[PDB]
Specification:
binds thymidine-5'-triphosphate, identical protein binding (chains A, B, C, D), homotetramer, globular, antiviral defense (chains A, B, C, D), alpha+beta, ubl conjugation (chains A, B, C, D), dGTPase activity (chains A, B, C, D), binds magnesium ion, EC 3.1.5.- (chains A, B, C, D), Hypothetical protein af1432
């Protein structure tokens, strides 16, 4: 019936239009309260207890802020209340498809358990939004508030996942192109979802955040680029834009890709793999499903949250023992031991289909060191991490349009050379982390010898503690000294 | 094994001595990651996702800070490393006893389920600590770090719950009395646990803290009082002390006793009660326990967390339907409707024994108005809340010792009218909230009539929205105009 | 001309309409950059470097925010862009009248150097605003942006100082009455000026602000009260409102009325007095003015800032020696020694005309102790502090109008009994601070004896350190022990 | 006399040893209250009201923190309380030499007014420190607290300015080398002064700092490096170290080198140059000094603060007209207009000796466009900014020693390719800003054409607004498109 106010630690008092409230107060949406934003990060950063729910509220809020500011500054855009509401809904709903421990689920588990399926949290969000709409009688409520469900649900879905297949969108015409750059920006990745997670993750992790999203909003316009209306930034802000991505990278460096956080996600993933044959999730009409198969019945996926972790942990079924045991090790803090980090040198990259063979390479290395123990490929974990600016090898700022103070409608491009010589010369790189599942002193020592030798053989970068953990290995490599 | 550093958003970088690390990395301690600090409050303040774990870490840290500060200011106290470690363990482990949704469990659920016991989270903490130590071989580690297991474990337990059974403490002599004022202060309620939850809860709720604990720590000495060495605050800090309690009250007013948060705690408690006979928790020996009986076996209690909620929410068994459905109504936000709030006048108390009778009273009222429906006692909930400065009717500052800059070692007293005339004249009061389980317009209107009439009959305070929700009724009471 | 954006640490990015910019970029306005918000408080709280300027910007911003909120929720109020601009201007300009060290000037210096005049910073703001307008050709700029200079200028002035003397305002009719409640609220003291100095002062002092003005703004409506459209708060907010004043009180208790900050304001005022005959400030037509007379010519007052402190301090003129030596004594931190604080009892109210008679009394007391050093009137300083809720003895909340969610257009009243019984019973009290200019040890002892015996004789409250600084005096007064 | 506690908004409650207090309570130190940290920055960022005084307290506090931490973690360094006091005094006093508006004075004014002298704020701080010691009888107070003035004063001065001209330090031997790395680090620039100004400047500017100095302090050790004991950072902090410098750079781009802030510093400088003949400052023995000569007499320098600004602003002397007017144009916000920014390409670097030749070059340019007005040299201003990581063209991280977890006493080196490929390739660049003193639309158009043409002639980078301000010029430079 009426609008609600929600007090958020990041944004303060957020006003929710009654339709938004209607969408939020569904099992499908409330489900997100039981899925941590940073998954295993919480097991390293105790302040990171926040879940996808509050993040989603923040995203909807910011989407609303940006679209409203745009409309207010430029009424000639003909942004309607319908547009605002659809953008807010998209913002609210683009996190619906996330599984247990967020990125652990779609980044590690699903690719291993369902390697044939090309699953994404975006598609999950579309399906789950469709299921929310259909299971909660949302359409009549949308019509009640002036929305046209066919068009507008199309538009929302497209905001989340892109064109459901020349102007490729069906939800809105070309003159409203800019609206697709708010919730999930496919062009350059500058969107409100990022802003909310910068602020929220920072607030909870104990890290200060360098990015001023409000400033950005106050310096954003719509201009015509390539006969298309796009969101443009004030030229002045180019530095701040570069910094934004820097921030992202920093956050991945300090927290998101923290080696222990990652190894914990890995262990939880192993536990899930070992529990997958014995865990039942009742889906549609009593039809049972698995952790790996919950993602193809939305009624089952709705009940697939962080809860799984605890179910496994609290089980008494002998068939779950192994899985249980793994989780229990996490509780005792008997984790796989981090052995080190290294990088490719020069031009060479590491292809995905090679990942599987990496622990064999390490185990096959021949360090000239005396060792009683002997490790095997299955004792090693090799985690390859692609760090980039969101557009693989490309500089996303080259895909941003700017405007000058004297011609606010004239879109211009700004090159990296026009800003600073102190900026990154590359926008993508790979970090290779090595862990060992054997945790005793001698095993960790051997693992270090194998690892550093492996780095030398592949002509990879010298590990930072190389001279310390493998003093007999490192001065074989002239390139390292 | 070495010290570990943990980054906390409240305290920053916290150092953990390896013994503390050993204690934390047990299932008994890690359990606290799965119990929300503010419970149902998370459903009103979406920022309040924080759990008892991070709060406990915070408490241990602050305990350490206080004892170290005292030690460094006054070497004559003979505060030892052992003392410091024991105080830190006491701070870390004094939240071990909380159950699912924290205070929902010891404050609502347990007194209803098993009204014949006197369960407290303190006792739970002692039992849980005992269980953690015994189940994890912590004693030999304790002596590895120069602790004496018998008397130090006694000392820790005593810091948690007070005298187990004249100087009543067996863990420490009276010349170390001040140590017992740090973790859980029975004398005046001024301890580090409060400080942590002030800062942390404020940080997550999105409301701001006003108490400066670091300042207090700065101006804290140990001075002699009534045969005892006790913690004394510098005189001019007295204002700040009153304010401290004022903050606590404020926190209860805005957040901890939020009408909706409380009614959600209520609905969840009811769901647990209706689920109690069917949820089995496997404890020691493989023996089966229930939610209400897990507190009798620490092995089962270890597995008693917020997960229950989801276990009830995700269930399929008919015997759980009535529980399950309740939780589902929380997801659809079909909550019991808040009817209103009133207070008793004079020095008129409402003892606990009368609580259960209050719903009947409201329904037995005679509103001289048309009513389309008649409500029964079982349609009403009367939640009565005691707001006080932590020592029932007493002024806790009357139990604080102070010192002046002219004589640092000399304890003194400061009376209330020696500070300000603007302070509360009382230090305890009662709030009466009334809800209606029937939600329809007509039943809610009727409920408002019944309620206001019930306020008039018992000469309770006039509901702020009295003239608006029952204009045919408030004229009868001439004291209300 | 276009609007400008200013980044403020409190409010973030605030927009300024070109008219406000034109008003700001004048010598009369920029003047405020050189006057400390907290005067001598900076010599106690090193973070409190902030000046009246930035505060003024904040006040204008918040005024704009509140009026926009009101207008966007209730279009039936017909709030024009003119109204918004005029409210913003009043917000910006209501600090123009402040003198050197802010409240030290109108609160100490002026009343002592010119006892016959009735000078307030508000009237000063009016005169300075008029001077700004006339000196800077602002009227046609106002016209350029749609303002009607005569009534709008009257309106702005009325918002600042009140009626320039049935409905007593010429600027706006009664149906825009609520507009007069935003910048300077004569009705209950709840205005945006308070909100800015709460947030800002707390930011700089290192004390934390617990009042949430954004929340208040979100919950504010305009309702009919005795045929007058007025600003009404949501019922639920009442507690927060009480707290808002409590906060004010706290900020006075901790910082604004800090004993050393006040005695420093006293020494500065004293020095300004002793310099008043000799300092020349050139005004209109080259005519020369004093410090105490600069308030008569706005051209001279424009040049009267904190700079005076440094003129005196840096001076070499023998005629200024006496003043100079005082400021230098502040630099060496040889301040008058604080003897203590006490309060009247029962019904006593130290009236202003009796203030001068206070050092005589203290110096007169016969404490009957061994007394190797006798002291006199001009050795003592007695400062009387009136702590209240901004409406003398009255409860400001009784002058606040509320609304309920069931009938948002229906204004109601709420009494203190409808809220809490932990609230204050008095809303005004007095504090008596005694210092001694004789800083040596024996003199200090003496002054303590004098002061305590004086408190006993006047039936004042027993000083907190009483039983330490006057051991042979405090056991006499039987109502003390 | 005893220890004092000071509440600072950045650090909270700082303890100051009585000796430090004696040093602080001097006109030479208190002088820093009247000098703004960011100078002209205040006129762009209204939050930047903070002064050198509070910053100095901050630096002393942090120096103390780092030395204490080092001493607590590593007893074998034999750090004495004498060392702690000397490092605190150095940190406290290393900003004593700053002049009016800080870096405007030593960076702009002095070089233009006294090109024949080498002047630095470091030399000024040493001089002012000696003056402080000699004017306030500090030596016997130093001796009173266990200091040895002859060697300790040398130690402090050495910490501030470096070797007074094989171990080149006299204050402390090589085994205390690490002590010189705290207050002002000549080796790599990582010192507590930076940490304080990061935190403080950010707090006041309304910018957010992502450098965690506390974390750095916790992971700092002293290890042997080349027969010295030096501060070593834990290996994995290397990323953070890079980020620290990145932060510095960011702070320079957003705030310290704000083009308007710089042009305001330039206008103030020009005003001082035009006032130098006439303003008099009375130093030792009544002798008179100019602003440019005050640095030759510490007694006069003690009176040289931001006050002169106001003096010039408030003067009636016709000889000061030209100075005064400029300041007046600052108040009216009639500033020199910003034409634009460019950068040298290739290897080319601009030396100071070429600066004055730059405005001549811009006016000597020939844009092939119809101009209505001819501009000359005096109409142009060229500001050259050097942006580096504190060590000219070098990577300061190549001058950081690290330590690994497994061998905490063994110092190692970490190269850039060992960390990230996304790091800067250069560590220095130049920014060239061009402004025009004539502010009419015509002269501005002309100036734009001149500037872009000049940029093209010297193969500089294409201005970001190039295609907009000069459409007839940018298509001529093939190197741009
Ligand atoms: C600062 C503050 C925040 N909040 C937060 C908690 C909620 O997220 C948000 C909304 O709470 P409420 O304002 O209490 O809204 P309500 O739904 O409980 O009451 P009603 O329907 O009658 O209007 O505000 C308070 O409730 N009280 C406060 O004093
Ligand atoms: C600011 C910051 C905090 N943190 C937090 C997260 C952790 O809670 C805490 C611990 O530091 P860690 O780097 O996580 O220590 P570690 O145990 O992973 O590595 P090691 O065993 O080699 O010492 O620091 C970072 O990890 N990185 C950062 O840059
Ligand atoms: C975060 C941030 C704030 N600010 C603040 C400082 C100012 O108070 C406010 C406005 O500064 P600018 O945005 O730089 O505006 P400008 O007037 O200098 O330039 P232009 O006229 O071309 O638009 O923004 C920045 O300038 N840059 C930043 O990166
Ligand atoms: C929060 C808070 C800070 N502060 C700050 C301001 C000061 O910078 C710092 C020290 O103030 P005080 O504690 O008041 O020290 P004092 O010198 O005035 O009193 P005394 O000599 O008798 O001990 O603490 C308070 O004074 N009071 C407060 O309640
Ligand atoms: Mg509600
Ligand atoms: Mg994305
Ligand atoms: Mg099937
Ligand atoms: Mg570790
Ligand atoms: Mg307690
Ligand atoms: Mg007022
Ligand atoms: Mg003092
Ligand atoms: Mg430096």
């Amino acid at each position: 019936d009426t609008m609600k106010v929600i007090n958020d630690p990041i944004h303060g008092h957020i006003e929710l239009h009654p339709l938004l409230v209607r969408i939020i107060d569904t099992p499908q949406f409330q489900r997100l309260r039981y899925i941590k934003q940073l998954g295993g990060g919480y097991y390293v950063f105790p302040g990171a207890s926040h879940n996808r729910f509050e993040h989603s509220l923040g995203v909807g809020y910011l989407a609303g802020c940006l679209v409203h500011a745009l409309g207010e500054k430029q009424p000639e855009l003909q942004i309607s209340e319908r547009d605002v509401l659809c953008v807010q809904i998209a913002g609210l709903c683009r996190n619906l498809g996330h599984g247990p421990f967020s990125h652990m689920f779609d980044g590690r588990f699903i690719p291993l358990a369902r390697p044939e399926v090309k699953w994404t949290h975006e598609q999950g969000s579309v399906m789950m939004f469709e299921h929310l709409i259909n299971s909660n009688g949302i359409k009549p409520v949308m019509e009640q508030y002036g929305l046209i469900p066919e068009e507008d649900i199309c538009f929302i879905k497209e905001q989340i996942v892109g064109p459901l297949e020349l102007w490729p969108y069906k939800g809105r015409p070309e003159n409203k192109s800019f609206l697709y750059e708010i919730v999930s920006n496919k062009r350059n990745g500058i969107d409100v979802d990022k802003w909310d997670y910068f602020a929220r993750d920072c607030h909870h992790l104990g890290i200060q955040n360098n990015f001023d999203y409000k400033r950005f909003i106050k310096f954003a316009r719509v201009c015509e680029v390539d006969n298309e209306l796009r969101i443009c930034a004030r030229d002045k802000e180019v530095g701040n834009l570069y910094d934004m991505f820097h921030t992202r990278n920093s956050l991945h460096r300090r927290a998101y890709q923290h080696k222990v956080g990652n190894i914990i996600d890995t262990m939880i993933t192993d536990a899930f793999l070992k529990a997958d044959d014995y865990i039942e999730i009742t889906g549609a009409g009593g039809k049972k499903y698995r952790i790996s198969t919950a993602i193809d019945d939305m009624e089952a996926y709705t009940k697939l949250t962080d809860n799984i972790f605890l179910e496994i942990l609290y089980s008494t079924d002998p068939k779950l023992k192994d899985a249980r045991e793994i989780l229990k090790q996490i509780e005792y803090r008997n984790l796989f031991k981090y052995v080190g980090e290294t990088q490719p040198t020069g031009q060479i990259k590491i292809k995905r289909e090679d990942y599987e063979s990496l622990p064999k390479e390490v185990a096959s290395a021949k360090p000239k060191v005396l060792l009683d123990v002997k490790l095997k490929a299955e004792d090693f974990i090799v985690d390859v991490i692609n760090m980039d600016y969101g557009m693989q090898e490309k500089n996303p700022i080259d895909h941003v349009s700017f405007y000058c103070k004297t011609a606010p409608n004239r879109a211009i491009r700004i090159t990296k050379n026009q800003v600073s010589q102190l900026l990154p010369e590359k926008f993508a790189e790979q970090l290779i982390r090595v862990y060992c599942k054997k945790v005793d002193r001698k095993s960790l020592y051997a693992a270090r010898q194998y690892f550093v030798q492996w780095c030398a053989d592949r002509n990879f970068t010298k590990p930072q503690d190389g001279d310390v953990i493998a003093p007999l290995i490192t001065p074989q490599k002239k390139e390292w000294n």
